[PDB]
Design a protein around this ligand. Structure first.
Ligand SMILES: *[C@@H]1O[C@H](CO)[C@@H](O)[C@H](O)[C@H]1O
Ligand SMILES: *[C@@H]1O[C@H](CO)[C@@H](O)[C@H](O)[C@H]1O
Ligand SMILES: *[C@@H]1O[C@H](CO)[C@@H](O)[C@H](O)[C@H]1O
Ligand SMILES: *[C@@H]1O[C@H](CO)[C@@H](O)[C@H](O)[C@H]1O
Ligand SMILES: *[C@@H]1O[C@H](CO)[C@@H](O)[C@H](O)[C@H]1O
Ligand SMILES: [Ca+2]
Ligand SMILES: [Ca+2]
Ligand SMILES: [Ca+2]
Ligand SMILES: [Ca+2]
Lengths: 318, 317, 159
């Protein structure tokens, strides 16, 4: 079925019906619909007028001979006939995410964390050809049937960001495979696999690496704020960076403790906490400077690293 | 050696067993030497240790303990398996060997020389089980890809030190001392100060995972005079003294439980000497417990400062 | 609310209404307005005629496939339908000034004199998306929430 491939679960449909859009590069069937009734069409307006189109032959993939627009039987004439609207194939967006959420495309992920990866994409030509996913190892060998996980190889349009196999996307597993760079190629089912119709995403499988904390400097004086960097974490996830209250100066009150970490950059929240309660920057009902145990900053890493900062005032000279 | 044989194009699968191969290629296969790295040689009973090693040609591994008998499994994880990365390396850090339900943990919970081995999880089962078998004999453990190492578990050791300024303490109103030492094999340590007048104070310190503890800025809220400090750590049994305090719970007496007993000593008409004698008799000498203590003494004197000598930059003292 | 984001204090609005302008790069919502009633539109005159536009997909950021102009349902036909006027996003001007007045952008100012700096800008796309300000140190770290002073991070057009 044209427009609705899921009606008959087909991966494609080339039976053109009056008025339905047709994309570049399609090899239109000439056995039904406009493919046999009106094999020849003429452009109507704009750059399309005058220019002819032949359904009996594949449509060129470039606009230099088939300008975009509406094509009629009468063309520029006032008569309205079975028409064809020509567009261009295009993949709007695509991403690789984890079952808990969070884009991980192009980033480095450990083997254990790649258990239930999902691939989603939004494109233009769902009405004609479903998009298809091919997974290739660093050597380029197809491994699609070995890493496929309980779903077909066809991604429905829309449903971008879906983390479940209930609707849209394709579920893949990369835990079995070794470390390396794996290429995910999205392309048309039959014909639309040129230019904007195809995409090549990358994924990096690596060994389980510890969360690395780094400072821009080692020896600093009081009052000089220092920026710290968290690396090797899962993208779109929350870490906690903690400071022992013992290093805090004794004369410091709750407010000084509640401002050791700054709200700079990727930092999501700053406060103090003990084993039973927390006092954030937005409240004072939590533990006091003595009641609390440590100072903490909840940081949400975006991409491959996160950046936060600390004010070194009200700290012991050790 | 093992060979792959290509056959003529168009031949059927069943019929191909008869005709000779059009061509073939041979290659060699060798076994993988799985072994452990971290647990070897000396070990401290009750202390958490890391587990790591190499598991080439394996996906999951299991750990067994042996002493003149079969190898017994340890319930390290829910599935009793450790995954192997793409680098043929496995690791499971900060596990308490003596704090597990399996018989191997009980065997390792008593001081002595033992053996600890690693085996493949696929070779671990011997009856088609989907999980690691509980017990394997010597022949079963040796036949599969496995390795072993000699381990020697020893008793816990305790040491400590107080930061006395001159053998005395800061002003009595806010007397402050610091403590440091090594308490390998334990999870928490207690410190108690007792004056001559029968007043008691206590503090709980969480020892680091490496066995070293260091606490600073401890307030001694006692009266001026001679004050004795005791540092206490529970032994293997994790119970203070006999485990049956004269008050409160009579089983599983922890340091927190001992704080309840301490809270009654001060209210009594006893002096410092009597309190020290009672605590020494109950915590240590009762039923020959495994708990370990150390002692220190100091005078909680008032603030004082004086000048000793004055001289030019020459030979004078 | 389209056109008037301050009506509901929203930072954006993607519910297109008949006749309201639409800028390049917008990801038009398909749940209300023209996003669901007429997902497909056809150009009317000029370079726009013939060329098609799909609200179900993001509008390209370049004019090479979506020429500027008015788009109808009937396109070049005489019938007038819910239309969409396509323009280009543009920031006309922007400046950094002191509370006493005087542009200080790009110049060198002492630390004490930066007590109450103001940032203003006039742009084109206030009817769709409010502009937003991000402050970065020499190392590029975001410091917006640390230097913000009693106002939001959205600059109104004009003023
Ligand atoms: C396109 O859709 C028609 C309608 O069901 C079907 O008959 C063709 O087989 C398919 O290609
Ligand atoms: C193009 O042709 C369709 C029918 O194929 C008609 O519905 C439209 O009005 C015309 O522009
Ligand atoms: C944590 O702080 C709360 C007060 O916020 C206190 O009630 C708890 O005893 C402490 O652990
Ligand atoms: C756009 O404006 C409409 C009208 O109030 C509102 O319902 C939508 O939520 C907003 O995006
Ligand atoms: C475009 O469409 C609007 C209504 O959406 C109409 O008011 C104009 O006259 C037309 O050009
Ligand atoms: Ca016509
Ligand atoms: Ca007792
Ligand atoms: Ca004991
Ligand atoms: Ca019109």
């Amino acid at each position: 079925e044209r427009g609705n491939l899921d009606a008959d679960s087909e991966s494609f449909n080339k039976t053109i019906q009056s008025g339905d859009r047709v994309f570049l590069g399609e090899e239109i069937s000439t056995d039904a619909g406009l493919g046999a009734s009106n094999p020849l069409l003429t452009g109507t307006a704009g750059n399309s007028e005058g220019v002819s189109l032949d359904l009996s032959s594949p449509i060129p993939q470039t606009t230099e001979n088939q300008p975009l627009g509406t094509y009629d039987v009468d063309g520029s004439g006032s008569a309205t006939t079975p028409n064809v609207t020509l567009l261009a194939p295009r993949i709007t967006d695509s991403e690789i995410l984890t079952s808990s959420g969070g884009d991980v495309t192009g980033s480095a992920i450990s083997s254990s964390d790649a258990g239930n990866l999902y691939v989603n994409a939004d494109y233009n030509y769902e009405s004609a050809e479903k998009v298809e996913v091919t997974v290739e190892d660093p050597s380029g060998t197809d491994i699609t049937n070995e890493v496929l996980s309980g779903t077909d190889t066809f991604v429905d349009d829309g449903s971008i960001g879906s983390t479940s196999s209930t609707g849209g996307g394709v579920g893949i597993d990369m835990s079995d495979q070794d470390a390396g760079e794996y290429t995910i190629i999205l392309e048309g089912a039959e014909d639309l696999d040129f230019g904007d119709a195809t995409e090549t995403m990358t994924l990096t499988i690596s060994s389980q690496d510890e969360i690395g904390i780094e400072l821009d400097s080692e020896s600093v004086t009081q009052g000089t704020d220092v920026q710290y960097t968290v690396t090797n974490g899962i993208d779109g996830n929350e870490h906690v960076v903690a400071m022992d209250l013992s290093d805090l100066q004794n004369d410091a009150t709750t407010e000084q403790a509640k401002e050791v970490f700054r709200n700079i950059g990727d930092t999501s929240e700053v406060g103090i906490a003990n084993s039973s309660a927390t006092n954030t920057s937005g409240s004072s009902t939590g533990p006091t400077v003595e009641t609390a145990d440590i100072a903490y900053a909840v940081v949400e890493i975006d991409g491959a690293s996160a950046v936060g900062g600390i004010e070194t005032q009200y700290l012991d000279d050790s | 050696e093992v060979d792959l044989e290509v056959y003529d194009a168009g031949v059927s699968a069943t019929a191909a067993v008869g005709q000779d191969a059009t061509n073939d290629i041979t290659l060699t296969i060798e076994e993988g030497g799985t072994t452990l790295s971290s647990p070897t040689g000396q070990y401290v009973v009750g202390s958490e240790v890391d587990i790591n090693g190499t598991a080439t040609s394996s996906d999951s591994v299991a750990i067994y303990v042996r002493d003149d008998g079969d190898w017994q499994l340890l319930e390290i994880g829910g599935d009793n398996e450790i995954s192997v990365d793409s680098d043929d390396t496995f690791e499971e850090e900060d596990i308490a060997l003596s704090g597990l339900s399996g018989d191997g943990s009980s065997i390792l919970s008593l001081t002595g020389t033992y053996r600890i081995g690693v085996i493949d999880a696929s070779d671990a089962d011997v009856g088609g089980d989907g999980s690691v078998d509980d017990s394997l004999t010597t022949s079963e453990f040796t036949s599969g890809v496995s390795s072993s190492n000699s381990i020697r578990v020893t008793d816990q050791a305790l040491t400590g030190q107080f930061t006395t300024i001159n053998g005395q303490v800061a002003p009595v109103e806010t007397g402050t001392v610091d403590i440091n030492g090594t308490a390998s094999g334990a999870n928490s340590v207690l410190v108690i100060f007792v004056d001559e007048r029968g007043n008691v104070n206590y503090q709980e310190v969480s020892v680091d995972s490496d066995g070293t503890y260091d606490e600073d800025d401890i307030t001694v809220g006692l009266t001026q005079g001679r004050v004795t400090a005791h540092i206490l750590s529970v032994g293997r049994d994790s119970a203070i003294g006999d485990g049956s305090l004269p008050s409160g719970p009579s089983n599983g007496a922890t340091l927190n439980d001992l704080t309840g007993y301490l809270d009654t000593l001060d209210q009594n008409n006893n002096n410092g000497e009597q309190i020290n004698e009672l605590i020494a008799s109950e915590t240590v000498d009762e039923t020959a417990s495994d708990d370990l203590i150390v002692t220190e003494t100091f005078r909680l004197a008032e603030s004082s400062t004086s000048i000793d000598s004055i001289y030019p930059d020459a030979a004078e003292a």
